Design an enzyme around this catalytic site. Structure first.
Site, PDB file in Angstrom:
ATOM      1  N   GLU A 192      54.255  60.536 -37.042  1.00 19.53           N
ATOM      2  CA  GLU A 192      54.433  61.796 -37.541  1.00 19.53           C
ATOM      3  C   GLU A 192      54.516  62.857 -36.392  1.00 19.53           C
ATOM      4  O   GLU A 192      55.499  63.468 -36.386  1.00 19.53           O
ATOM      5  CB  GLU A 192      53.386  62.110 -38.695  1.00 19.53           C
ATOM      6  CG  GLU A 192      53.407  61.416 -40.032  1.00 19.53           C
ATOM      7  CD  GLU A 192      54.688  61.830 -40.679  1.00 19.53           C
ATOM      8  OE1 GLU A 192      55.369  62.795 -40.156  1.00 19.53           O
ATOM      9  OE2 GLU A 192      55.075  61.339 -41.624  1.00 19.53           O
ATOM     10  N   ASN A 230      61.403  72.705 -41.454  1.00 16.52           N
ATOM     11  CA  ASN A 230      62.570  72.239 -42.249  1.00 16.52           C
ATOM     12  C   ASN A 230      63.768  73.307 -42.793  1.00 16.52           C
ATOM     13  O   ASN A 230      63.607  74.341 -42.827  1.00 16.52           O
ATOM     14  CB  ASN A 230      61.926  71.603 -43.448  1.00 16.52           C
ATOM     15  CG  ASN A 230      61.241  70.626 -43.044  1.00 16.52           C
ATOM     16  OD1 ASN A 230      61.565  69.833 -42.223  1.00 16.52           O
ATOM     17  ND2 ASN A 230      59.986  70.608 -43.214  1.00 16.52           N
ATOM     18  N   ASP A 251      56.433  71.460 -41.730  1.00 17.64           N
ATOM     19  CA  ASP A 251      55.391  70.157 -41.393  1.00 17.64           C
ATOM     20  C   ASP A 251      54.464  70.563 -40.403  1.00 17.64           C
ATOM     21  O   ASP A 251      55.069  70.708 -39.130  1.00 17.64           O
ATOM     22  CB  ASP A 251      56.265  68.909 -41.179  1.00 17.64           C
ATOM     23  CG  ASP A 251      57.245  68.584 -42.186  1.00 17.64           C
ATOM     24  OD1 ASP A 251      57.060  68.919 -43.372  1.00 17.64           O
ATOM     25  OD2 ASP A 251      58.300  68.050 -41.647  1.00 17.64           O
ATOM     26  N   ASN A 306      53.216  68.910 -45.310  1.00 20.80           N
ATOM     27  CA  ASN A 306      54.289  70.146 -45.538  1.00 20.80           C
ATOM     28  C   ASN A 306      53.597  71.290 -46.362  1.00 20.80           C
ATOM     29  O   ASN A 306      52.740  71.278 -47.123  1.00 20.80           O
ATOM     30  CB  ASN A 306      55.199  69.324 -46.141  1.00 20.80           C
ATOM     31  CG  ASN A 306      56.397  70.205 -46.864  1.00 20.80           C
ATOM     32  OD1 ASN A 306      56.638  70.685 -47.790  1.00 20.80           O
ATOM     33  ND2 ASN A 306      57.496  70.446 -45.681  1.00 20.80           N
TER      34      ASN A 306
END
Ligand SMILES: [Cl-]
Ligand SMILES: [Cl-]
Ligand SMILES: [Cl-]
Ligand SMILES: [Pt+2]
Ligand SMILES: [Pt+2]
Ligand SMILES: [Pt+2]
Ligand SMILES: [Pt+2]
EC number: 3.2.1.17
Length: 127
Positions: A35, A46, A52, A59
């Site tokens: 991650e 995003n 995130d 998120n």
């Protein structure tokens, strides 16, 4: 902070992640590796308005509040900036909430795709 795998493993273990809801420590370390590359400050902003955050790339739609994401639920009851701390407690506590709220570790795409079904113990081997 960019953790080492063994140092992260020990920190996660101090916060009860080994075998949390049947997921071994290596799973959690592997999730963090893929991650965020162990970087507590990681962010991925995003196109859907969400972001995130942190070592586990949690998120901002469902889990933490950054104030700017549509559809915010803030189920972890924390500002997303708390997930960017050097110490991992807030991330770990929210990760546990994410599982407690009906999710497997498949909630983490990097886990599903890069850790699921693999030798996750490699990530704590030699620690
Ligand atoms: Cl904790
Ligand atoms: Cl705790
Ligand atoms: Cl928001
Ligand atoms: Pt700690
Ligand atoms: Pt601790
Ligand atoms: Pt803890
Ligand atoms: Pt702690």
């Amino acid at each position: 902070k960019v953790f080492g795998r063994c140092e992260l493993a020990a920190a996660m273990k101090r916060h009860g992640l080994d075998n949390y809801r049947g997921y071994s420590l290596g799973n959690w370390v592997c999730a963090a590796k893929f991650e965020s590359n162990f970087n507590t400050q990681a962010t991925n902003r995003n196109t859907d308005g969400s972001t995130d955050y942190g070592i586990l790339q949690i998120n901002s739609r469902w889990w933490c509040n950054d104030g700017r994401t549509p559809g915010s639920r803030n189920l972890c009851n924390i500002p997303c900036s708390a997930l960017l701390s050097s110490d991992i407690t807030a991330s770990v506590n929210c990760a546990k909430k994410i599982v407690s709220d009906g999710n497997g570790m498949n909630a983490w795409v990097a886990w599903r795709n890069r850790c699921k079904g693999t030798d996750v113990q490699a990530w704590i081997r030699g620690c």
